[PDB]
């Protein structure tokens, strides 16, 4: 049986994968994560595959682990699948060779995503799938959501019969996240197509001790080649098997496919060859242009590997004179990209007609591939015929791009209604849009399409929804650029973004704002918008959604009001029926907490309809007075690069705007001043005790402690209230807590922990603080930071240091950023940061916003994100460089001492050499050398003078989350700590993979709910700390800001100063954990985490052992019995209690028992008199020795693996017995 | 399952070229390193004895029990549990929620009281 | 000078790699193991590179770890190299995109060895090096023991001046283990060919808190494509 | 000895190394079946994935 | 019918014993992350590590299982870091059976470990 | 009358340099690849050489 439904590419694919598989080994990675998660949910819900069984799915430590597990399951006779992309797919490559090598029917489902090179991108292109084209996997592409479902089925059926593994792929986001009304098959239908004989043979040849075989042998030159060629027959049959199943599936669905399909004019003279979602847009353009007589066409590539030239030519019109092959990737240095090269080989081998073949590159990292661009591609074949071009960018550096005329007419089928919705993060717009699609898709014959563009900013971000509805199939795999309906759900956007860009003349524009009266509308609505509305005779509507929502008691949520606006003014359905479904659905959905809630929304609709009246505007609007640029002062880079990007104009920046190596300058976040907080703290000086705790805890550096001399407050504003500084050392200074209202995120942590019962910080509406504080912050900023008054590593003193990571895109109240900001206040000016991919790399470096900055002297954290799996090794490498280069400097210094260098110079050199690894002494003498050697360019002194950036001892740090530290990067972390070198590892433990969507990690606790632990994790939290402490020579410590800011600072100094490896694990609160009362309770939660004994604090210091003292020290106290309330105050635990109360109770009891036993173990460790010793060094000398030197018997075998240049001498190979046995035998054979 | 070091480690090490070769080439360092190994195994055996004599070990509570079904970590949460970025977007995401930009529950409640009007 | 001496492909290559490098992150895998062991033994013996310094070389937990360390050393301004093959090279692929993407003068010396599919093989072919052809590394082949030395040198000199990483490769066993009478250059001669200004510029652009920058950003669809094409002039 | 205790019903996921080399260097296969034709089902995936490989067999 | 399907699955009747074989290089270094994850899974698999305290097959290179003072490639002047304690690290899980054996010392202890671990 | 073109720089692949080494008299050219990419229309070097001739258009 068939079945219609609105769903996305991921779901359409997972629908099939679940049915056709018995086992799945997964690992999360955007944008394929949805598939694995759905598979887990469905298995838990009771969904059965074609064998009537629930899917056996397990999460591994990385994609490499998943690929190995997939290989093992297949080798052992179970139909297996996995979901991956980009960096993940790369880690599977080694096993792919083995899986295809052993002819196993595996199926990988990949959301093709860009590979991280100059930068990382979670978006779609074929860089990843092309990187595995040589692994021996068949490769089958889907170009649309409907095809994602169809090709997924063909892939599984074909893999089973052919014994050649398949990689079914579709474009990341453009297809994986696009919503379409499609048709899916039920599982019984899928099962009916399985080749039972092939399935039986698969089971029979699989590993099993009842009938064993050996696989994975090692082979010499005599037979390897023949062995590699033995599978040829299987690959020769794959194409026919793929065709067989496209046809069998077609007999059930009515949708036919070929290895290569052609669309367009039969006598086309210009043809494009493409693969993926681009094919949909290309066909749309062909329909439009061909109808005007253009002889153009397209060949869609379905089966990329094996590549069958015969099938390619079968789709090629003999009339083709020019052919452009489009590749969605870039292989630097290659004579051409993959598909282009494959096509060239087909023509070369054919040896007949040779049409002009052109290569073109498009869509990297989901770059738009619009109708206008397709037009450029066809025009190019009849025009200049530029080869090896790029389209979608302006390459003003190497001139490879095609010009694009965006004046191209709309090519969507007649009757198609296109909509755009501008919403504010979490305002429910996206949710409403999705419901609208389902409602319309389920109650009409209309096709529906949905695609959402989100913001990089995690809180208060901008989301732009693109929806399309039509009587004809929607092949528009590109953003809406000419809408009939445009809604702005956040009035703030009116004066910051070009929300009316491209809207059709006479189009509908709905705005949510309290500017009902014409006076107010003229007061806020910019002249540009006014002129646009009047000139296009747009049907403008204004609705005070907030007011309507509040009146009906909806608390002010506008989602239901704007939903009504859509159903009434969009025109997709008739008013009557339109309002009908919406209401019927309100009952369908909700209908939970009595009718009280059901009635409010129903009323909201009623009121909205009555309120939605066409705003009547005067004709004078046509030529309203243009405003004037009232923009503040910012960098040249912010003005020319950042600003354009933040205002949705990034696509207009040419190649010349960027650095060849992808680098970005620090501090660009300084000028964003988003101002998205709803409420911000208000300082109440009369109650302030001048403790600086508020600034210490801020997740965005929105609090600036001010300490200035009287003379520095002369030209200070009237309301720039300041107190006389408390403290003996601050005698005479003026103190003030300056709130940065525009960078504040409104989390509330500061006001929450402000000590005085009569709070010195009270949350208030942003609009009541900005007018006064904005100019105040500006003035405060010009006041020199007094970093020399108090100890840098003291609670209060630390906040008198320049924070070097500010205003990041982390969520409001993020539990990670407070820690990092403080670390920079202590070592920022001399640290290197090797950051593992994750939330910290995302809020840390999402272009164009760079929160890390430099101090007044231009010094700042040298930050870098290599990959997710290599953070520790990446940092270790930085450490190796500093060692090699500073040692070089040290040798030069020593030589300089044995020269006629001046007394002062030699004095400084000796000083530096004596304290080169001391942060204080190295800087002291380093600075002297800079002055003394200034201008020196010759000889030894010249070399030393040019190495000034190596003088001061640097601090190498490795930042990463728990997923990195406990799972994927653990092997590297373990090895780096075991090295004994001077590096510092800071782990922000959120007890879950946060960035990717809350997946379980080995750091996740017993009973916590998370993806792949949806019934509460059934294994306890991995004890990373205790595992690392077994080394004895590694500094290990745990911290929790909320419990003790002092202990955290103490740990930072001890860890950093330890002349060896240091590991610091911090408790980081996260929105994924579901804090009941808000993230503004983070500090409180961190505090209770420790007191309850859930997260005990301690320090393991090896140098104490070197001085005869126990290295292990416990910093917290025994469990105070508050664990139960601690857990229930977090939804990650509470949600389980509400769903499975019995299991939940036992699981929470398990946690209490675990922490009880662990604390007692820690106490025993602190009371022990037996501890591992510690020694920094004690040898080195000079020279080396081989392990076989002077050995009595052979120490190496006679194989190729141990052969070395100097090997080959005769030795006793142990084939005559021991020395004693040989001696005894000689005595017995006297003769 | 074994007994305390019997003091024959030096002979054990010197009977293997991987150790003896160092003694022949770098006698001073070797002597130091063999003594270090002796100390390491001494400490380690004592730690193992401590593990065996302890009355505190890692035991587990009854269990969790079978759970027919599952639940999402964000279900019924007071505030948003997911951000508004492409990485956390899911088929069922998009619903309105408190994004923590207005303060904690109590702070918001107090503000309400202080604003009443 | 031109004094003919007998040696194998690996040694001829290591001879050059040691002189032209400051740091090496290694992991053993047949048939490239000899190079890493030679580099480590020479460093222990105090052999000096062209900068008059002993090579800083460490063994990682895998080739993935080695590639990560190479990336970090290069990012932090040290000339770096590694030796690998087959399965090992495959584990270095992710970092290879990063090393070329960031235009770092790294040099990989690879003894081309078969990839394990229907079976494992420690012997020679180009299955491994071709598996990394899209990573953005320049690829320079040696066809003899003499060429192993010569191309190893060209690879290092060119990487330094071009800022594009190089994979210098030669056939596993057939060349890596073949012994031939060839000519190798002394270290002074190799040092004389280095573009010292390019080297200084490499140091100046590297990671350092005295003059920080951000590398490894995450980019949206609005600018990723432009950023990927920005390196064209270098290639 | 391990095979003398569980040989007839065991799967072996072998990491690359000496044990995979003396274990399965073509054409010499030392692992054998008992009188009933039962014996260790042996496999070498890669050097880095032995545990995961065995884990997959278990799944 | 059903009896037919069941009859065709006879090679699945007897409980099997899944073993993972590897050297110290695999267990302590390159395969450690995987070994760690798999043991943490809590599933029924048996891991047997043949510790030669060096990467043997490739030519005697040092591994984290190599002891202090042992000479090996990359430990050309005697290893200067102690042997990694894989055993104690894994015992921290509490739900993993961990044991060490040495045939020459006791064949009986070895046999007891095999029986108990399996 | 036979010859050989030795490939030194495989990447970047410079077609102009390849042609500078090709005798105008060549009627048949065999590209030998020391690899196997199952299902590919051809191995790496062969595909690169084919593209050079297609682009030359002579
Ligand atoms: C090889 C690879 N696999 C998967 C991903 C996708 N990914 C990026 S970060 C991440 C989890 C981050 O978790 P964590 O380390 O805990 O940091 P958090 O975001 O929780 O701070 C995942 C699964 C990737 N980039 N690379
Ligand atoms: C990714 C990868 N890196 C390196 C190698 C080369 N290699 C194979 S086994 C091995 C060491 C084996 O050491 P161990 O695990 O201790 O076993 P032993 O040979 O000592 O029994 C090495 C370095 C490989 N096959 N794959
Ligand atoms: S409310 Fe939050 S973001 Fe704002 S100043 Fe306070 S701690 Fe910082
Ligand atoms: S936390 Fe409160 S008392 Fe302390 S410095 Fe800040 S405003 Fe003042
Ligand atoms: S760690 Fe959690 S709270 Fe912080 S940015 Fe990530 S998702 Fe948001
Ligand atoms: Ca340290
Ligand atoms: Mg985390
Ligand atoms: Mg070993």
Got the DSSP string for A162-202?
A: H---EEEEEETTTTTT-EEEEE---HHHHHHTS-HHHHHHH
A188 phi, psi to nearest 5 deg: -60, -40
Q: The domain A627-667 belongs to what CATH superfamily?
A: Pyruvate-flavodoxin oxidoreductase, EKR domain (4.10.780.10)
What tokens appear for A128 in the block? 């990843």
Give the DSSP per-residue string, A107-138: EEEEEE-PPPSSSB--S--SHHHHTTTTSS-E
How far apart CA F55 and CA F19 sit, in angstroms, is 12
Render the burial of B34-45: b for 16+ CB within 10 Å, e for the rest.
bebbbebeeebe
Residues in chain F: 58
A267: buried, middle or exposed (CB in 10 Å: 19+, 13-18, 0-12)? exposed
Please check whether residue A751 touches B, CB under 8 A. Answer: yes
In the annotation, is A995 catalytic? yes
Tell the residue nearest (CA) to atom 7 of ligand 3.
A698
Residue D38 near ligand 2, beta carbon < 6 Å: no
Residue C39 near ligand 2, beta carbon < 6 Å: no
**F18, F5 in Cβ contact below 8 A?**
yes
Nearest residue on chain A to C79, judged by CA atoms? Answer: A881
DSSP state of A326: E
Question: Residue E6, CB half-sphere, CA atoms under 13 Å: how many?
Answer: 3
> How far off is chain B from E9, nearest CA to CA, in Å?
28
Distance A819 CA to ligand 5 centre (A): 13
A333 forms bridges with which residues in the sheet?
Answer: none
Contact state of D19 with E22 under an 8 Å Cβ cutoff: yes
Number of H helices, E strands in chain A: 43, 35
How far apart CA A357 and CA A503 sit, in angstroms, is 38
Distance A1082 CA to ligand 2 centre (A): 46
Helix boundaries (H) for C45-195: 63-75, 86-101, 127-130, 145-162, 187-193
Query: Locate tokens 């099962």: which residue?
Result: A191
A917: buried, middle or exposed (CB in 10 Å: 19+, 13-18, 0-12)? exposed
- Pick from A38, A125, A124: which is nearest to A81 by CA? A38
Residue C85 near ligand 2, beta carbon < 6 Å: no
What tokens appear for C130 in the block? 């071709």
DSSP state of D25: B
How far apart CA A368 and CA A375 sit, in angstroms, is 14
Number of H helices, E strands in chain C: 9, 9
Cβ neighbors of A679 (< 8 A, separation 6 or more) are: A746, A748, A763, A764, A765, A766, B101, B102, B103, B107, B108, B111
**A390, A401 in Cβ contact below 8 A?**
yes
Please check whether residue A235 touches F, CB under 8 A. Answer: yes
In the annotation, is A394 catalytic? no
**A417, A446 in Cβ contact below 8 A?**
no
**A1064, B74 in Cβ contact below 8 A?**
no
How far apart CA C53 and CA C46 sit, in angstroms, is 8
Q: What's the sign of the alpha-carbon dihedral A1036, A1039, A1044, A1046?
A: positive
Pick A1023's closest partner by Cβ from E14, E59, E92. Answer: E92
| Cβ atoms within 10 Å of B117's Cβ, excluding its own | 2
- Pick from C153, C87, C169: which is nearest to C121 by CA? C87
Give the DSSP per-residue string, A918-961: SHHHHHHHHHHHHHHTTT--SHHHHHHHTTGGGSSPPEEEEEEE
Distance A876 CA to ligand 2 centre (A): 23
> How far off is chain A from E108, nearest CA to CA, in Å?
25
Strands (DSSP E) found in chain C = 5-8, 23-26, 56-59, 80-84, 107-112, 138-142, 166-171, 179-182, 214-215
Please check whether residue E52 touches B, CB under 8 A. Answer: no
How far apart CA A424 and CA B101 sit, in angstroms, is 12
How far apart CA A271 and CA A282 sit, in angstroms, is 11
C58 is in an annotated binding site: no
Give the DSSP per-residue string, E40-93: HHT-S-EEEEE--SSBTTTT-B--TTSPTT--BBTBTT---SPPP-HHHHHHTT
List the catalytic residue out of A113, A674, A886, A1099. A113
Nearest residue on chain F to A308, judged by CA atoms? Answer: F41
A574: buried, middle or exposed (CB in 10 Å: 19+, 13-18, 0-12)? exposed
DSSP state of A726: P
List the catalytic residue out of A776, A995, A996, A1087. A995
Contact state of A658 with C227 under an 8 Å Cβ cutoff: yes
Tell the residue nearest (CA) to atom 5 of ligand 2.
C29
How far apart CA A393 and CA A368 sit, in angstroms, is 9
Contact state of D13 with E25 under an 8 Å Cβ cutoff: no
| Positions at the binding site of A for CoA | 426-430, 458, 559, 601
Query: Locate tokens 């590593």: which residue?
Result: A793
Please check whether residue E112 touches C, CB under 8 A. Answer: no
- In this structure, what is the dihedral angle of CA atoms E76, E78, E80, E84, given to the nearest 10 degrees? 100
How far apart CA D45 and CA A268 sit, in angstroms, is 50
Cβ neighbors of A1013 (< 8 A, separation 6 or more) are: A1000, A1004
A551 forms bridges with which residues in the sheet?
Answer: none
How far apart CA A1113 and CA C144 sit, in angstroms, is 61
Element (H, E) at A372: helix A371-382
How far apart CA A822 and CA A799 sit, in angstroms, is 8
**A966, A1020 in Cβ contact below 8 A?**
no
How far apart CA F45 and CA F13 sit, in angstroms, is 10
**C227, A662 in Cβ contact below 8 A?**
yes
- Pick from A37, A842, A562, A835: which is nearest to B89 by CA? A37
**A1185, E60 in Cβ contact below 8 A?**
no
Ligand nearest to the CA of A1060: 6
Strands (DSSP E) found in A267-402 = 270-274, 296-301, 303-305, 322-327, 356-361, 389-390
Tell the residue nearest (CA) to atom 4 of ligand 1.
A29
How far apart CA A318 and CA A267 sit, in angstroms, is 8
Question: Residue A283, CB half-sphere, CA atoms under 13 Å: how many?
Answer: 19
| Cβ atoms within 10 Å of A687's Cβ, excluding its own | 15
Render the burial of A1182-1211: b for 16+ CB within 10 Å, e for the rest.
eebbbbbeebeebbbbeeebbbbeebeeee
Distance, first Cα to last Cα, chain D? 26
Element (H, E) at A638: none
A chain contacts of residue F37, beta-carbon cutoff 8 Å: 133-134, 136
In the annotation, is A324 catalytic? no
Q: At what angle do helices F44-56 and A338-350 cross, to 10 degrees?
A: 70
Strands C214-215, E17-23: pairing is unpaired
Q: What is the CA radius of gyration of chain A?
A: 34
Please check whether residue B108 touches A, CB under 8 A. Answer: yes
> How far off is chain A from F52, nearest CA to CA, in Å?
8
Element (H, E) at A11: helix A9-20
- Pick from C59, C70, C68: which is nearest to C23 by CA? C70
How far apart CA A1033 and CA A15 sit, in angstroms, is 51
Query: Locate tokens 């302030």: which residue?
Result: A688
Q: The domain B56-117 belongs to what CATH superfamily?
A: Pyruvate-ferredoxin Oxidoreductase; domain 7 (4.10.790.10)
What tokens appear for A441 in the block? 């898709």
Cβ neighbors of C113 (< 8 A, separation 6 or more) are: C29, C30, C31, C32, C85, C86, C121, C122, C123, C124, C125, C127, C128, C172
Distance D34 CA to ligand 7 centre (A): 50
What tokens appear for A834 in the block? 């090797």
Q: Where are the domains of chain A?
A: 1-257, 258-414, 415-626, 627-667, 668-784, 785-1169, 1170-1231
A1134: buried, middle or exposed (CB in 10 Å: 19+, 13-18, 0-12)? buried
**Domain A1-257 falls under CATH 3.40.50.970:** yes
**C95, A867 in Cβ contact below 8 A?**
yes
Q: Is A322 helix (H, G, I), strand (E, B) or coil?
A: strand
- Pick from A98, A181, A97: which is nearest to A146 by CA? A181
How far apart CA A1117 and CA A1101 sit, in angstroms, is 19
Contact state of C44 with E77 under an 8 Å Cβ cutoff: yes
> How far off is chain E from A1090, nearest CA to CA, in Å?
21
D9: buried, middle or exposed (CB in 10 Å: 19+, 13-18, 0-12)? middle
- Can the peptide bond before residue A995 be classed as cis, meaning omega within 30 degrees of 0? no
- A258-414: CATH topology: Rossmann fold (3.40.50)
Distance of CA A545 to the CA centre of its chain: 34
Looking at the CA of residue B82, tell me the nearest atom of ligand 5.
7
> Do A1-257 and A1170-1231 show the same overall fold?
no
How far apart CA A191 and CA A184 sit, in angstroms, is 14
A445 phi, psi to nearest 5 deg: -95, 5
Cβ neighbors of A712 (< 8 A, separation 6 or more) are: A783, A784
C138 forms bridges with which residues in the sheet?
Answer: C166
- In this structure, what is the dihedral angle of CA atoms A505, A508, A514, A519, given to the nearest 10 degrees? 30
For A:771-810, CB contacts with B below 8 A are: none
Contact state of E58 with C26 under an 8 Å Cβ cutoff: no
Contact state of F40 with A133 under an 8 Å Cβ cutoff: yes
List the catalytic residue out of A38, A63, A178, A368. A63
**A962, C47 in Cβ contact below 8 A?**
no
How far apart CA A1112 and CA B47 sit, in angstroms, is 14
How far apart CA A720 and CA A703 sit, in angstroms, is 15
Cβ neighbors of B51 (< 8 A, separation 6 or more) are: none
How far apart CA C148 and CA C138 sit, in angstroms, is 16
Tell the residue nearest (CA) to atom 5 of ligand 5.
A810
Q: What's the sign of the alpha-carbon dihedral A1115, A1121, A1126, A1132?
A: positive
Query: Locate tokens 């549990």: which residue?
Result: B81
Cβ neighbors of A1071 (< 8 A, separation 6 or more) are: A811, A813, A1079, B79, B80, B81, B82, B83, B100
Element (H, E) at A753: helix A749-753
Please check whether residue B71 touches A, CB under 8 A. Answer: yes
A111 forms bridges with which residues in the sheet?
Answer: A170
What tokens appear for A185 in the block? 């098959």
- Pick from A420, A417, A416, A383: which is nearest to A402 by CA? A383
**A516, A540 in Cβ contact below 8 A?**
no
In the annotation, is A82 catalytic? no
Strands (DSSP E) found in A575-656 = none
A chain contacts of residue C218, beta-carbon cutoff 8 Å: 119-122, 456, 841-842, 845-847, 865
Residue A126 near ligand 5, beta carbon < 6 Å: no
Contact state of A1170 with B87 under an 8 Å Cβ cutoff: no
How far apart CA C21 and CA C155 sit, in angstroms, is 12
- Pick from C101, C218, B87: which is nearest to A849 by CA? C218
C113 is in an annotated binding site: yes
| Cβ atoms within 10 Å of A523's Cβ, excluding its own | 9
Q: At what angle do helices A575-588 and A429-443 cross, to 10 degrees?
A: 110
Please check whether residue C145 touches D, CB under 8 A. Answer: no
D chain contacts of residue C116, beta-carbon cutoff 8 Å: 46
Element (H, E) at A707: strand A703-708
Q: The domain C1-235 belongs to what CATH superfamily?
A: Thiamin diphosphate (ThDP)-binding fold, Pyr/PP domains (3.40.50.970)
According to the entry, how was the structure determined?
X-ray
Render the burial of F25-41: b for 16+ CB within 10 Å, e for the rest.
eeeeeeeebbbbbbbbb
| Positions at the binding site of D for [4Fe-4S] cluster | 18
Angle, CA of A475, A478 and A481, to the nearest 5°:
115
B94: buried, middle or exposed (CB in 10 Å: 19+, 13-18, 0-12)? buried
| Cβ atoms within 10 Å of C48's Cβ, excluding its own | 15
Three-state secondary structure readout of A991-1054: CCECCCCCECCCCCCCCCCEECECCCCCCCCCCHHHHHHCCCCCEEEEECCCCCHHHHHHHHHH
How far apart CA A915 and CA A932 sit, in angstroms, is 18
How far apart CA A555 and CA A1091 sit, in angstroms, is 37
Which own/partner pairs from E81-85 qualify as long-range (CB within 8 Å, at least 24 positions apart)? Answer: E81/A978, E81/A979, E81/A980, E81/A1033, E82/A1031, E82/A1032, E82/A1033, E82/B40, E83/B40, E83/E53, E84/A978, E84/A1031, E84/E28, E85/A1030, E85/A1031, E85/B44
Test mutation, A228, A232, A344, A352, chain F, max F CBs within 10 A: A344
Please check whether residue C95 touches A, CB under 8 A. Answer: yes
C164: buried, middle or exposed (CB in 10 Å: 19+, 13-18, 0-12)? buried
DSSP state of A814: -
| Cβ atoms within 10 Å of A894's Cβ, excluding its own | 12
**Domain A668-784 falls under CATH 3.30.70.20:** yes
Cβ neighbors of C50 (< 8 A, separation 6 or more) are: C19, C20, C187, C190, C191, C194
How far apart CA A644 and CA A847 sit, in angstroms, is 12
**Domain A1170-1231 falls under CATH 3.40.50.10860:** no
Resolution rounded to one decimal, in angstroms = 1.8
Contact state of C177 with A1203 under an 8 Å Cβ cutoff: yes
How far apart CA A865 and CA C216 sit, in angstroms, is 5
Label residue A103 left, alpha or beta by phi (over 0 means left) and psi (-120 to 50 means alpha): left
Residue A991 near ligand 5, beta carbon < 6 Å: no
Distance A179 CA to ligand 1 centre (A): 26
How far apart CA A166 and CA A157 sit, in angstroms, is 10
């Amino acid at each position: 049986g068939k079945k219609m439904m609105t769903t996305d590419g991921n779901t359409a694919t997972a629908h099939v994968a679940y049915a056709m598989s018995e086992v799945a080994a997964i690992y999360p990675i955007t944008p394929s994560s949805t598939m694995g998660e759905e598979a887990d949910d469905w298995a838990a819900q009771g969904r059965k595959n074609i064998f009537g069984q629930t899917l056996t799915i397990r999460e591994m430590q990385s994609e490499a682990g998943a690929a190995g597990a997939v290989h093992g399951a297949l080798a052992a006779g179970a139909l297996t699948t996995t979901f991956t992309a980009s960096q993940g797919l790369l880690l599977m490559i080694p096993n792919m060779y083995k899986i295809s090598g052993e002819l196993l029917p595996g199926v990988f489902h990949v959301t093709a995503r860009a590979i991280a090179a100059h930068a990382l991108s979670i978006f779609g292109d074929h860089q990843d799938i092309y990187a595995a084209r040589q692994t021996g996997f068949a490769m089958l592409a889907s170009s649309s959501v409907q095809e994602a479902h169809d090709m997924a089925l063909v892939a599984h059926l074909a893999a089973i019969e052919s014994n050649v593994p398949f990689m079914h792929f579709f474009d990341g986001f453009r297809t994986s996240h696009e919503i379409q009304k499609i048709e899916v098959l039920d599982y019984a239908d899928m099962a009916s197509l399985v080749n039972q004989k092939a399935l039986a043979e698969f089971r029979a040849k699989s590993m099993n001790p009842e009938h064993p075989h050996v696989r994975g042998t090692a082979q010499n030159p005599d037979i390897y080649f023949q062995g590699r060629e033995a599978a040829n027959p299987y690959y020769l049959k794959v194409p026919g098997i793929v065709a067989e199943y496209m046809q069998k599936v077609a007999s059930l669905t009515g949708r036919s496919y070929k290895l290569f399909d052609y669309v367009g004019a039969p006598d086309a003279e210009r043809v494009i060859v493409s693969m993926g979602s681009s094919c949909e847009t290309i066909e749309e353009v062909i329909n439009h242009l061909a109808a005007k007589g253009e002889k153009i066409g397209l060949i869609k590539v379905r089966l990329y590997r094996p590549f069958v030239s015969e099938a390619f030519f079968a789709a090629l019109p003999a009339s083709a004179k020019v052919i452009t092959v489009l590749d969605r990737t870039k292989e630097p240095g290659a004579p051409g990209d993959p598909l282009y090269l494959d096509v060239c080989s087909a023509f070369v081998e054919r040896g007949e007609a040779m049409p002009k073949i052109l290569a073109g590159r498009y869509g990297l990292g989901s770059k738009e591939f619009s109708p206008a661009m397709v037009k450029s591609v066809y025009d190019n074949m009849s025009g200049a015929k530029k080869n090896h071009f790029t389209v979608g960018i302006e390459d003003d550096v190497t001139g490879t791009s095609l010009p694009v005329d965006n004046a191209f007419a709309d090519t969507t089928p007649k009757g198609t209604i296109q909509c755009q919705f501008w919403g504010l993060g979490a305002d429910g717009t996206v949710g409403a849009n999705k419901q609208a699609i389902k409602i319309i898709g389920d109650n009409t014959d209309l096709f529906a399409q949905g695609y959402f563009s989100y913001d990089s900013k995690k809180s208060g971000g901008i989301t732009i929804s693109h929806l399309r509805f039509g009587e004809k199939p929607i092949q528009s795999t590109y953003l809406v650029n000419r809408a009939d309906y445009v809604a702005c759900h956040n009035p703030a956007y009116v004066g910051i973004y070009d929300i009316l860009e491209g809207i059709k003349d006479g189009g509908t524009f709905v705005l949510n704002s309290p500017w009902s009266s014409l006076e107010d509308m003229d007061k806020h609505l910019p002249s540009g918008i006014k002129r646009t509305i009047a000139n296009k005779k747009l049907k403008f509507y204004n609705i005070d959604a907030v007011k309507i929502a509040t009146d009906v008691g909806l608390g002010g949520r506008i989602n239901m009001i704007m939903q009504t606006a859509f159903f009434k003014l969009a025109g997709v359905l008739p008013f009557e029926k339109a309002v009908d479904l919406l209401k019927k659905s309100i009952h369908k959905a909700y209908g939970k907490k009595g009718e009280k809630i059901v009635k409010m929304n129903t009323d909201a609709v009623d009121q909205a309809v009555t309120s939605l009246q066409e705003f009547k505007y005067p004709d004078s609007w046509k030529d309203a007075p243009a405003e004037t640029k009232a923009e503040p002062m910012t960098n040249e880079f912010f003005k020319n690069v950042v600003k354009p990007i933040l205002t949705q104009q990034g696509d207009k920046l040419p190649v010349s705007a960027f650095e060849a190596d992808g680098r970005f300058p620090l501090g660009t976040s300084q000028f964003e001043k988003r101002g998205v907080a709803i409420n911000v703290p208000q300082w109440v000086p009369e109650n302030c005790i001048q403790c600086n705790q508020c600034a210490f805890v801020c997740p965005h550096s929105a609090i600036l402690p001010v300490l200035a001399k009287e003379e520095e407050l002369v030209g200070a504003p009237a309301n720039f209230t300041a107190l006389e500084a408390k403290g003996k050392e601050l005698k005479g200074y003026k103190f003030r807590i300056q709130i940065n209202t525009l960078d504040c995120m409104g989390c509330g942590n500061c006001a929450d922990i402000c000590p005085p019962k009569e709070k010195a910080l009270v949350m208030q509406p942003l609009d009541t603080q900005r007018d006064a504080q904005v100019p105040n912050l500006e003035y405060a900023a010009r006041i020199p930071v007094k970093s020399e008054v108090l100890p840098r590593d003291s609670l209060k003193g630390s906040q008198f240091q320049e924070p070097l990571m500010e205003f990041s895109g982390a969520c409001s109240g993020c539990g990670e950023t407070p820690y990092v900001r403080v670390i920079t206040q202590l070592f920022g000016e001399r640290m290197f940061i090797a950051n593992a991919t994750g939330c910290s790399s995302i809020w840390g470096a999402s272009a164009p916003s760079m929160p890390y900055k430099t101090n007044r002297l231009g010094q700042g954290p040298a930050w870098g994100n290599s990959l997710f799996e290599d953070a520790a090794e990446y940092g270790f490498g930085m450490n190796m460089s500093m060692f090699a280069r500073r040692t070089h400097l040290a040798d030069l210094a020593a030589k300089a001492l044995e020269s006629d260098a001046s007394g002062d110079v030699k004095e400084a050199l000796q000083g530096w050499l004596a304290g080169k690894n001391d942060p204080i002494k190295s800087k002291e003498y380093g600075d002297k050398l800079k002055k003394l050697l200034a201008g020196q360019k010759d000889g030894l002194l010249g070399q030393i003078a040019a190495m000034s950036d190596l003088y001061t001892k640097k601090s190498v740090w490795i930042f990463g989350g728990d997923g990195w530290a406990y799972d994927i990067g653990y092997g590297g972390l373990d090895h780096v700590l075991a090295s004994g070198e001077d590096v510092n590892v800071f782990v922000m433990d959120t007890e879950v993979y946060s960035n990717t969507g809350g997946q379980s990690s080995k750091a996740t606790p017993t009973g916590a709910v998370a993806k792949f632990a949806a019934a509460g994790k059934r294994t306890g939290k991995k004890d990373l700390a205790r595992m690392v402490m077994t080394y004895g020579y590694v500094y290990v410590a745990t911290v929790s800001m909320g419990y003790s800011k002092q202990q955290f600072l103490k740990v930072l100094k001890e860890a950093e100063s330890f002349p060896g490896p240091s590991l610091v694990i911090a408790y980081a609160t996260c929105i994924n954990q579901g804090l009941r009362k808000g993230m503004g309770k983070s500090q409180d939660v961190m505090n209770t985490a420790v007191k309850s004994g859930y997260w005990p604090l301690f320090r393991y210091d090896p140098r104490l052992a070197a001085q005869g003292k126990n290295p292990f020290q416990l910093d917290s106290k025994a469990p105070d019995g508050s664990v139960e309330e601690f857990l229930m105050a977090q939804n990650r635990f509470a949600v389980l209690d509400r769903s499975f109360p019995e299991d939940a109770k036992r699981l929470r009891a398990q946690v209490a028992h675990e922490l009880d036993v662990r604390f007692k173990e820690l106490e025993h460790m602190a009371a022990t008199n037996i501890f591992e010793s510690f020694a920094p060094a004690g040898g080195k000398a000079d020279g080396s020795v081989d392990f076989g030197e002077g050995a009595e018997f052979c120490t190496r075998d006679d194989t190729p693996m141990m052969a070395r240049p100097d090997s080959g001498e005769a030795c006793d190979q142990n084939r005559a017995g021991t020395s004693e046995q040989q001696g005894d035998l000689s005595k017995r054979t006297k003769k």
